From a paper:
In humans, the CALHM family encompasses six paralogs, some of which function as non-selective channels that are permeable to large substances such as ATP. We identified the three paralogs, CALHM2, 4 and 6, to be highly expressed in this organ. The CALHM subunits thus constitute unique modular building blocks that assemble with different stoichiometries into large membrane channels. In contrast to previously described CALHM structures, where the oligomeric state of individual channels was described as uniform, our data show heterogeneous populations with CALHM4 and CALHM6 assembling as decameric and undecameric channels with similar abundance and CALHM2 as predominantly undecameric proteins with a smaller population of dodecamers. Despite the unknown activating stimuli, our study has provided insight into gating transitions of CALHM channels by showing two conformations with either a cylindrical pore of uniform large dimeter within the membrane that is constricted at the intracellular side as in case of CALHM4 and a conical pore that continuously narrows from its extracellular entry towards the cytoplasm as in case of CALHM6.
In each case, we found a heterogeneous, about equal distribution of particles with two distinct oligomeric states. The smaller particles are composed of decameric and the larger of undecameric assemblies, both of which we refer to as CALHM4 channels. In each structure, the subunits are arranged around a central axis of symmetry that defines the ion-conduction path. Both assemblies contain pairs of CALHM4 channels of the same size related by two-fold symmetry that interact via their cytoplasmic parts. In the plane of the membrane, the dimensions of decameric and undecameric CALHM4 channels amount to 110 Å and 120 Å respectively. The diameter at both entrances of the pore measures about 52 Å and 60 Å for decameric and undecameric assemblies respectively, thus defining the properties of an unusually large channel, which could be permeable to molecular substrates. Even at the constriction located at the intracellular membrane leaflet where the respective N-terminal helices NH project towards the pore axis, the decameric channels are about 20 Å and undecameric channels 30 Å wide. In our data, we find strong evidence for a layered distribution of density inside the pore within the presumed membrane region in non-symmetrized maps and after application of symmetry. This density is observed with similar properties in decameric and undecameric proteins in both datasets of CALHM4 obtained in either absence or presence of Ca2+. Collectively, our data are compatible with the presence of a lipid bilayer located within the pore region of CALHM4 channels, which could interfere with the diffusion of charged substances.
Author numbering:
A (entry chain D), B (entry chain E), C (entry chain F), D (entry chain G), E (entry chain H), F (entry chain I), ...: 4 to 83, 94 to 280
């Protein structure tokens, strides 16, 4: 009874998407907890933030796109009427699967926010504080970029540090919620538009998806079996018996040329 | 039902590649934690870094290439039209499998970064620090190369030490992210180019892969069975019965020459 | 289903080689942890190092070579055209199996390095240290060879001790990596050369290996069964019945000479 | 399926030899840890060392030789052409089995070395030490033989004690490695010589071993069954029925003489 | 499958002998640890040692001899040509089984040695000690026999006590090793002599042992079954039915004399 | 398969005797540990010792004799040629079983010895001690009998107490070993004499024992079944049906006299 | 297979008697530990001892006698030649079963002795003690009866208390051993006398016991089944069908008198 429930969940898109999201959340948490430390350098902080904020998104997005077998076939159809719209719908479905990873990564990393504070710990507009009046500009940059990582200064400095940190965390979390709401509204309007521009009815679509999936599977199985049978026939012509046999009473010794013959694969 | 799922995962490339990457991560972590210590010598530091940074990459890459059985056959075809392009595609697929190990090793070792700081702990451009003004050049080299391993000096020295360490860790992690992004973009463009220059359709390719795999397997099985039968026939001609038999009622004692005859293997 | 997977792994060379390497690593670790202590004598240190460094390599190599049954048969063919090349290929395959143990022993013992420091704790070139200027030569040897095992001297002495130890550990680990890289490149070029000089195709080789293995096994089984049947016939001629029988209704009492007759084995 | 794997390992010489070696290692460790203490007497130390070093070797060697059933038969053939060489090969194989125990005992006891220091704690050549100049010869013997077991003297005495102990441990371990290497090289050259002087081919030898083993087993079984049947017939002649019977309808009461008749065993 | 392995081990002499030795070692250890304390009397010490040293040997030896069923039969043959030599061989085999217990008891008790020191704590030749010069002879006996059990005297006394104890332990262990080596060499030469003087071949001996064992077993079973059948027939003659029966339709009431008749056993 | 091994051990005398001995050892230990305390009275100590030393022996011996069913039958044969000797052999075998308990009780209680010291704590010959010179005789008895249980006196008194205790423990243990050796030698000589004076051969004896045992068992079973059948027939004559029946279609109501008839048992 | 071993043990008298004895020991221990405290009154102590010493014996004896079903039948035979002797033997066997409980209770309670000291803590003959000279008689009774339970007086009083307690415990244990030995000798002589005066042989007795037991059991079963059948027939006559039936096709409604008829049981 196992394989029944296995296939049932494997078809169920909700479970697969939820598992992907959970995996990305856990991986992000472990990653951030292990190998993250703000540089607290002079001008090389914003890059160290932006990298961790963005690059994983691009990587996971490209990976989630390119790993889908159907996308390669669609590109091959495209690379050097109704077929165009159907290709667009196919591509859109694969996109709807693949987008789940980068958006959830961005969401969790903005909500925890510990990345963003390092990303923009230098842009804090300081104009209404007593300790930043007389000090030099470069001295201000130095004392400003050192805030996130450590603290050893007097009380007022660590208090203004706490204040800047809270402000930046607020900004990060608001930006995260904005990203979530915009992503959701865009996904909804896009799915509705795709359902609108579809040339098929509410029933031909399901038939079509089943057609595609079962086509791929059956053709794979058939090609495998056919090539196996043909290679088996060549083997039997060479040695004199079918390999899957038993108690064979006839054996043909090969000639010093038959090896040369079987060398080519006939493609 | 076991062997079904075993073969299913064994065909699945994603699981194999993920397992390889996890194994390399764990092995690298154990290795670095056990047998690594910066030399803190005068000029013999950069080599001690570069070795651990590079040599495992070359070793694992050559091992992941040479261990693939098909690569030896392709080289034999090459060593002393359509066949050339097909060989190129075969070689490219094996490469796509083998490259996973060295790149993940480099990635994890640069991201942890503890190797790179030892690799280039001497190249730190020191020009704007108060304790490196009057001191001699060789004295500067000595005091500079001692930073990574230990600390016993006054406060200002350990502070400039912490600063150099943070700078170098930042450089290492940025270099790592650059390596990852370049590797990914190169892999993607290369796979797309390979799919472009392919002379086969979206269906002949799958048939072709199944052809290759099943060809290898079936020919192995057939050759084994055929040689077994032939050796069995020689044995029965010598001793007078088939070995796989039971309740044999006839035995032929060998002559002092038959041993000389069976000595040769007929190749 | 057990014996299926047992035979599958038993044919798989990768698993066997990996198990051998793991066993050697564990054994080396236990050995070194239990029965190793630097002599700290005057001139009898280098030998105590070199023994543990080398002798296990020779022992394990000779054991891994001589224990392979096929190597004895090949030597018998050699000891007092195509057969020569085939013998060379057979010997090379057995070598490829046997070399795994000594090289991994050397690798792990050099990487841990605790052997090498005792091996060459006397050759340290001391010329730029303040405490080795006025002291006598033999006094220098005495104070130099005592470094690895214990420490009771003032601070400067234990510091120069730590420095010599770090230098020697660095040298050991670099030598180990050099050994690994040279061994790998040599193994690769040698395997490629062997595949080049081979007179057989990519298919005759597999057939040939299966031929050898099944030949050995079947001949063993057949010889056993044949000798069993012949001895059974002699027994039945003597006592008057086949031993594997039941409810025998005839018994022949032996004569005082029949014992003398059955005494010889007929070889 | 149990008895299959049991017989498979029972034929496998490697596993049996490895188990013997492990058993001897464990037994030696327990023995030494429990019942060993240096006498620290005047002239009765060297014997107490040599006994534990040697006598177990002789005992285990004689036991491993005499316990092999085939060795008794070979001696009976010897005790009051081709047969001589075959006997030599048989004896050599049994020797190759039996030698594993004493050599591993010597190896482990020399490598731990705690025996050797007690064995030769009196022969230490003391000529360059300040506390052994004026003291009398017998006083020197007394103070020298007391080193291994206990320590209560001032610092310089316990330091020279530590030094003598380290020297002697070094000597013991080197002697052990020498014994191992010489034993291995001798075993290898001897096995090669035996394979050289053998009059049989690479195939007759296996047939011969199977002949010997199956001969012994089958003759044992047949003799047992035959004697059982004969005794059963005598019993049935006496009492009037076969013992292995059931529902016997005839009983013969013995006479006061039949007991006298059955008294003799007919040999 | 249980009874197969049970009989296999039960025939295997090595396992039985090893179990006997282990049992004697454990029993001796428990015994000595529980109920042993040196008397420290004047002249009644040597006996208290010798008893524990010897008497268990005699007891275990006589028990291991007399408990073997075959020894009683051999004595009955002896008590009031070839038969003599065969009896000698039978007796020798039983001896080879029985001797294992006393010799291992002596060995373990001498090696631990705690018995011997109490056995001869009075014979210590004291001539070169300062505290035994002026003291009276009986006073010397008193102070000498008190050494093993307790200590309350000044330092020099307890030191000479420790020295005497170490000397005596050395003597005990050497005596033990001598006993082991002499026992082994005697056993070997005796077994070889027995194999020499044997009138039978290398094959008649095994047949003979199987003859003896199966003879005993079968005769026991047959006698049991025959007497059971005869008693069953007498019962059926008396009561009128076979006891092992069911649904018997005829019953014979006994007479007041039939009880008198069945009273005798007919021997 | 259970009942097979149960009967096998139940016939095995060695296991039964060993279990009896172990049970007696454990019971004696628990008994002595729980309910033993020396009276330390004036003249009532020796009895309190002798009771625990002896009375359990007599009780266990009489119990082990009288509980054997065969002993009652032999006495009945005796109570108001060959039969006499056979009765003697039967009685001797039962004795050999029964003697194991009292002798092991005596052995363990003498070896622990804590009973004997209380048994003869008053007979200690005191003539060479300083504190027993002037004191009165009855005062000496009082101070002597108080030794075993408690101690509150000055040092010299408790020392002479320890000395008397050690002497008495030595005497107890020697007496125990003497009892063991004499018991063993007597048992051996008695068994040999019994085997000597036996009128039967080495085979008639086993037949005879099997005869006795199976006779008893079969007669018991037969008598039971016969009486059951007869009572069943009487029941069926009374009520009109066999009780072990089912679906009986005929019932006989008893008369007011039939109850009077069935009242007698017919013996 | 369970019920076989259950019946085997249930017939075995030894196991039943041993279980009864163990149960009485445990129960006595729990009882004494829970609800016992000496009254330490003036004249009401001896009764409080004697009750716990005796009354349980009488209770358990009467219970063990009256609970045996056969004893009631024998009394009925007795209550208002050979039969007399047989009744005596039956009664004697039941007595031999029943006596085990009271005697073991008395034995364990005397051996622990804590009851007897309270029983006779007032009868201690005090004539040779210094503190009982001048004191009044009733004062002596008061101070004497307070000994067992508590202690608060000066040292000499608690010492004479300890002495009286030890004396009384000695007396209790001796009395217990006397009771055991007399009980055993009486049981033995009585059983022998019963075996002597028996009119039956060594075989008629076993037949007789089996007769009695199987008679009781079979008659019980038969009476049960017969009464069940008769009541079933009456039921079927009333209602019109056999109750143990199914699918009955005929039902007889009862009349208002049939209930009056079935009211009587016919005895």
């Amino acid at each position: 009874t196992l394989n029944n429930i296995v296939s049932s969940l494997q078809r169920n898109g909700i479970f697969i998407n939820s598992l992907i999201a959970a995996l990305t959340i856990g991986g992000q948490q472990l990653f951030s907890s292990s190998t993250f430390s703000c540089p607290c350098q002079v001008g090389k902080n914003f890059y160290y933030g932006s990298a961790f904020l963005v690059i994983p998104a691009l990587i996971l997005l490209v990976a989630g796109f390119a790993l889908r077998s159907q996308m390669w076939t669609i590109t091959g159809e495209y690379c050097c009427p109704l077929e165009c719209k159907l290709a667009c719908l196919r591509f859109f479905s694969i996109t709807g699967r693949a987008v789940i990873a980068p958006l959830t990564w961005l969401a969790v990393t903005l909500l925890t926010g510990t990345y963003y504070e390092c990303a923009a710990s230098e842009f804090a507009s300081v104009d209404h504080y007593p300790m930043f009046d007389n000090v030099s500009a470069s001295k201000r940059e130095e004392i400003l970029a050192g805030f996130p990582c450590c603290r050893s200064a007097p009380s007022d400095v660590i208090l203004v540090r706490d204040e800047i940190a809270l402000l930046h965390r607020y900004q990060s979390q608001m930006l995260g919620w904005i990203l979530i709401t915009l992503a959701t509204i865009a996904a909804l309007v896009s799915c509705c538009v795709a359902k609108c521009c579809s040339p098929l009815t509410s029933l031909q679509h399901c038939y079509w998806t089943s057609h595609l999936q079962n086509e791929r599977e059956l053709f794979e199985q058939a090609a495998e079996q056919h090539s196996r049978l043909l290679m088996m026939h060549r083997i039997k012509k060479l040695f004199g018996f079918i390999p899957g046999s038993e108690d064979v009473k006839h054996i043909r010794i090969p000639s010093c040329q038959d090896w040369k013959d079987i060398s080519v694969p006939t493609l």
